[model samples]
Target: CGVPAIQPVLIVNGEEAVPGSWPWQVSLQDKTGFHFCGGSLINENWVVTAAHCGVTTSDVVVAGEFDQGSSSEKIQKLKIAKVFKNSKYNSLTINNDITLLKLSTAASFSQTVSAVCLPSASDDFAAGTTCVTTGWGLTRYTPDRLQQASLPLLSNTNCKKYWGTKIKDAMICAGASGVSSCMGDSGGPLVCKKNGAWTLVGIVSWGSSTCSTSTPGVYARVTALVNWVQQTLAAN
Candidate 1:
């Protein structure tokens, strides 16, 4: 017997969701009171974001958050008790720009709060695969409350053509046509479907400073960081 989770048949405001899709999406905030970055919950106590997002001790992770300025019981806020930045992270290269946040309290999963599965260490997403990136980041013009855009994953070779030789083996490329992750979208998930399940494939690292549609966005490849993430989780 197979059991499938059922989502609430209710729709309110601008929330458009599936039963098990995007339950891991969350917003990260600094004491400065801004939705500066996005993150994905990997487990009850572990959240994976980008190191360059500049997490602080007093930072907060708000789950099931859509409207930036709005709050309710559906939104769960947790303090970032600790941060684990990748040791090999290169600021100049922006190569290993991934990080993890340890929450003070384990987050409870529900209709809108859930964890996203990480890709297996040996897995790879072929170029041209369609993926999704969600965040409360800002564009060149107006700030998006909470935006989601489908990005077409680009091949490493093509990505290097657009962004230059800085593209490394530890990274993945996505988006194009003036639609890409912009400022404040850092540390968000670049997720793709594998085996009918959504898997976290990349962490939004860097892209065109101009946020051009013609430019593609680069992300930290999750498959390359699986061991680091696992070890960090085990040791912490």
Candidate 2:
């Protein structure tokens, strides 16, 4: 499921990505049919995003989508059957900020649609390791095409230096000067290559109010929350 026929990012200070590159990337749209947040397909019927997005059953999950304004055969908009936010999630702290969406029907795997690998709780991508995050988010201008940027993973200790107590072990830190995940890019994937395959290491959660590079973008660390994900999926 992790190995994809096609590959690709959501980003600030990023560039346009080639079509169908990030097969697991999905757009979380509101009832009005507007793209709001991004998500990663973890399985045929499941998607992982951010709890802070406050997604509901009214929201639709679009797979294999790129340009929002353009019509495409690859796009598959699915009705959400259920929304599962971590029970321990805290909006004030943005802790345990991961959520799951169950599709009414399973998404068909294709060149532009596939599932990303989830990391184990023991898995760790070292600090300074380069990873990619993708979404159809804002730059200087709101871009219609999907955007991507590379960010190096930051250690919690170093990240805490910048964010103080705001940074937690349940979260991951990434980004640097002039590069980060922004508003519209929330709930997107922070993926790093592990064992020659793309592995979902984080889920976009929060960042500085200004999208400042000084305060690296924070995500729900998959390693810390993967156990919760497995338990939730199994019970549901």
Candidate 3:
């Protein structure tokens, strides 16, 4: 595992992100201005989310928003130029559950929005490493504002014991009792501190049918797909 080459920071647990704090977080919304998935801005022209999120070219990426209580919170509505879903993605198994969205136009790194740093392809965090996830999802598919939670990275071996053979290297398991991503949380950011900087490590993928209890939230491992991400972006 590659430990960070930077310093660590003190991160508060269980709270809301100060407005514009998570500049890379975005709301994957529909034409009706309804959110169906969460996404992270990987660059000025691309967003990374979950393949299972069902993103289409027409879908809008809402950015510079800290809340989804209304359309007024949106600072920009980015149209998707194209969607590049992982070719190996399996709906039944939920494998390779990552996606990339090319924006119709490039976005400026405004006060309300910016790109998040990505871990190297070979970077790996050990079990029990502290991490955080943010989303606007609800346990019952209801509307909600932005929320954040501190979740510890779990060992894959330990995760497989609970998730069975479905767990693999391409995914990361993180969550704690009573604190987990629920329905509509898919495609959001699962980040950790590295060298005192926030780095994008995972994309929310799936979880228990109900968030009523303790359940490990699974996410698409970003480090595992760093090569594909770079290749796709360079070619596109």
Candidate 4:
């Protein structure tokens, strides 16, 4: 599911993403037509995001978008038909922060639109594993275009030293001293290549108050929660 028509390259501290490089990247917007969070298109009808994004039926998921300011880029706007927030999701601790959005209809796949691969539940990524994150989130300057960043995963032991016990098993950490997934990037995909395909490893969750801090950005561990995703998909 993680294969795209055009393969993606790496970015750090984020640079403008090449159009159609990240076909599964999603912009989760509010009713006011504002992009608020990032997500990954797991399939034509399911999107993976963070529960804290507070998505609703009125919220729209924009797929295959490179430049948010443009009039067209094969962008598909789909209404959220349902929200499937993880039952274990905690607002205070932000544990199990993942959520699934069911699209009202299937998205038409194209060169700039496709599904990202989901990591198997048994997959365990090691520390120092590098991955890519993409979104229309804040960077050094106000952003209108999709940004891409390269970050390396940090060990849970090291990550917990920064965030303390709040860093649970359900969460994974990734970033460098000057690189991170910033605000407005919440619920985005943090993908690592596995077996020659990009696999969703993390769902952007939270981070230190400062984006560039040594404290790595925390994400909902896709490996830990993919079973739930599969179950939800099967039942619904």
CA lDDT for candidate 3: 0.80
**lDDT, each prediction:** 0.78, 0.87, 0.80, 0.87
Tens-digit lDDT track of model 2 for 93-176: 999999999899899998889999998889879999999989976775257888888889999999888889998779989997
Model 2, position 183: C-alpha lDDT score: 87
Misplaced by over 4 Å in model 3 are 1-14, 70-74, 139-141
In model 3, how large is the Cα lDDT of residue 200?
88
lDDT of 4 by residue, 1-236 (tens): 88888877652278888889999988988878799999899888999999999999989999888888889566789988999999989999999999999999888888889999998899978998888888877785248888988889999899888888989989999886577778899998999989989999999898866676456899999989999999999999
lDDT of 2 at 52: 91
lDDT of 3 by residue, 1-236 (tens): 11222222221124565667678889999998888899998889999999999998878998888767655674888889999998988899898899999999887677667878889998878889988788888745244567777788998889887788989878889885458787777899998988867888889998777664466888998888888999999999
Shift in Å, residue 174, candidate 1? 0.6
Q: Which ten residues in a row have the lowest lDDT in candidate 3?
A: 2-11
* Cα error of candidate 3 at position 143, Å: 4.0
Backbone clashes, candidate 1: 2
RMSD of 3: 4.1
Q: Please provide, for model 1 over 1-236, each residue's C-alpha lDDT reduced to its tens digit, 9 standing for 90 to 100.
A: 00114322220012233433467888888777678888889988999999898888788998876666555436788987898999999989988888899999889887667778887799979998987777666655325356667778999999888878899999999888447787877898888878867789999888877777778888999999988999999999
Q: Which stretches of candidate 4 lie over 4 Å from their true place?
A: none
Question: What would the TM-scores of all predictions be?
Answer: 0.89, 0.96, 0.90, 0.96
Better of 1 and 3 by TM-score: 3
